[PDB]
């Protein structure tokens, strides 16, 4: 248990899950918005021109 | 010792100073590869415009 503090992580199963899905719906949402601002970025410069 | 057979990572200590001097050297070139990459297509994304 020492060890496990040492480490400096909680390790409890329940939190483990709540923690990845909570991740992972981030992930997602960043990789749509690099995407938007990808097409964004191509329409704010070609109607400024 | 089990623990140490089922991780199956042999981990010596010229091969841990080894591993992480190729992984970083390899991180660092990723990062200026990607750099390049990104220049690049921003030089060619203004020249189509």
Request: net charge neutral; charged share 35%; hydrophobic share 40%.
């Amino acid at each position: 248990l020492q060890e496990m503090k040492d480490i400096g992580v909680q390790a409890d199963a329940n939190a483990e899950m709540r923690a990845r899905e909570r991740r992972d719906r981030l992930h997602e949402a960043l990789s749509v918005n690099r995407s938007r601002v990808n097409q964004l970025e191509k329409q704010i410069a070609f109607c400024e021109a």
